[model samples]
Target chain A: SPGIWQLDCTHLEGKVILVAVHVASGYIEAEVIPAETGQETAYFLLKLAGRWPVKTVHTDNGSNFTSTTVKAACWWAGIKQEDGIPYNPQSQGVIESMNKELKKIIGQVRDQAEHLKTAVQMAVFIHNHKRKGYSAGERIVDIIATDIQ
Target chain B: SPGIWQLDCTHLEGKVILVAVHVASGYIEAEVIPAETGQETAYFLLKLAGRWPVKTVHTDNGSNFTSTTVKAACWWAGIKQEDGIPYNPQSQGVIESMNKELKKIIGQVRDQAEHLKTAVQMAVFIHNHKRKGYSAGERIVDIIATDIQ
Candidate 1:
């Protein structure tokens, strides 16, 4: 539930990208959003896997993550919101490291080109499936799915 | 480098209190704010130790911490902002621990009573001195303030 900042896109000078990772499986999902509002974050999360009966959500106190709208949404979904402390960056180290990898791959292609999006997607795809040339312990897609329904 | 949330007070039904902890020396400051706005939180933080030459601030991504207004203030003050991650609550464990201790001591007296604030202040006084029987290695007020300006 943390974002990678200052992604330079050719068409968009500076854009914010939000990233969410499965705590158990190392599977990650991302969004390139126009604005970093809690509302947008909540919506993106729902679109990604929020409805699959998530047990809990952990986020830093980003306004986009902590706004009343986001809180209400999580409450409605019956998910508890857990927050990290200030200054301790290790808690979200995984996502931040993933962000760095994403930037490196995404930077190779032209920013606004379709190839750029494809590159991003492909990088995540391989990451989820390959997990560094080894089979991912658990598939991200599977983790994001549930039998609750 | 930390935040305080929801300090219960008897007279002030739904009041919010913010506490700031100095990362280096174990010093703490508190404020009973009119609103939980980033603007107010920033002002309170500044008032607490503006002249101490604060180098950085660590906070959760609460709207108050992430607001443009608060960011602007910290920018003007030349203090870097450190944000915690979402869903990882262990990072802020220290501050949260402190809050629980504070509440237990403060709750001993009537909420909102003059005596209650006095008790709270006294509790913090001993906290800064003895660190609640835990040695912080270096004391804050003694460190931040030099005999000379």
Candidate 2:
């Protein structure tokens, strides 16, 4: 059995924050990058695949997601690449809301942190530890630990 | 008297979520657009200026922000355009983290709403009514009311 994951990027402080979230578990992996280039995005995808068992990667029609590098990366990872409909939120609603939550948490963390990177890390940490419906009231960290083990 | 605000866009589903955040009081205005084009961006800026007292609009080097349409809009509104250093998080840390929080909140709202537009509005509503440091523990809604009045 394989799992589906959604990927997207958001901008903050002139940098791109790339994120991937598991559709079923709500587990997420995020990184702050200098740009939204295909090379960087492909590298992030590869790294995420190495750590998690991803079968299909769903994303929007952004250049970074549609680039040849990302396609090749998906091929190498033995994962299928799925693109969402243009200008449609219903197509990728899960990640859409997840990204919003991530942004909100990061803002709260920045109020207490000295750096953006630290704030992001802390935000992701808080997100994963929080209980949610997908994890059935267990934290994402707890579900993920048992997921891959 | 003038205030500094930061402008940025995040992608959700397949749409562009354009946002402007006040650096001092954390008051925010956001709109979901079909694309991140200069025309759409300029319109949003002009509308924001109509309601808020904006002195400077800070943004990154994104084409949407640097376009001639945006330049003309800023000129007409008597707003100065400020650009941050490329790839530097320190330059726009406040809006950077705020965008993350917006994304997170949008996700939470989407979970309960039937439409993405509705979710975004609900997210922004919850954000504006919440108290924060810049508001001196008062809600952003209360601060903004006293500010413009």
Candidate 3:
């Protein structure tokens, strides 16, 4: 929580979005996941792993997390799996809070053209930029710099 | 951990603080527990239990959670205990985030006339006040209002 980050999925108007939050910086990464296959979760984590090489991951004891695909991918990546007890929402607080904020913002503009995606982008920007001290955007830039080296 | 909130202790410049967060509402409860006995944790949890009879609790597999004193108290209170994996922080995200915020803010002002405790009080204020829309203060007020009826 303090040292490591986490990822999880949330729903918006019947649609699902997978989100990851860097705990210390409150940086967010998310994508609209069209399906619930373990592959989607694995794919998301793998992409994130490429960025930071996470040493551990925490998620609910849901099928997607426990599936052979996700288990194998994480095992191969050498990330320790820490499955959370079922039905605990705050255990994944950042992503869950993001989910609540996204729903509220998106719900306001769902009828506008491209508004859903646009609002999500703006929300992410606002969260990182308006943070109290260190900003999430700086973390992303720092991560990318190392990634390119 | 369905129906369970969690409590944990973290250090700031060697001072220990005990913190517990509600699983669903993002509400927080904490105290400056400068000592490490399991009894301090139990005492804090017992005080929290007075506010809302906790049905269950989650914590790390540390002596604080497993010691006979804590175990018996929880059993007496009828709160089921769920333990998280050792070294995995994400399983207890909200308290961890609060802990980080507390330390950063307090560290900035620990040498001031008021010291760390006063800053922690202010940190709690800022967290609830600046929350996206439905503030943590609002949630607490709502809960209390309904609780009174």
Q: How many residue pairs clash per model?
A: 12, 13, 2
TM-score of chain B of 3: 0.75
Comparing 2 and 3 on TM-score, the stronger one: 2
TM-score of chain B of each: 0.68, 0.80, 0.75
| Highest-scoring model, lDDT | 2
Rank candidates by lDDT, best first. Answer: 2, 3, 1
- Two-chain DockQ for each candidate model: 0.01, 0.01, 0.01
- Model 2 alpha-carbon drift over 4 Å, by segment: A1-149, B86-92, B133-149
The sequence of per-residue lDDT tens digits that candidate 3 reaches over residues A1-149 is 32255666776656676766765556666666666578667655654553343667776347866688778657645567667553555555645666787677556645532534434543444455544544574554344333433
Instruction: Report the lDDT of model 2 for residue B83.
Output: 79
lDDT for residue B74 in candidate 2, whole number 0-100: 82
Mind giving the per-residue lDDT tens digits that candidate 2 earns over B84-106? 45365664676667778888988
Interface C-alpha RMSD per candidate, 1 decimal: 24.2, 20.5, 21.2
lDDT of 3 by residue, B59-95 (tens): 6447866787677557645678777553565655755
List TM-scores for all candidates, in order: 0.39, 0.44, 0.42
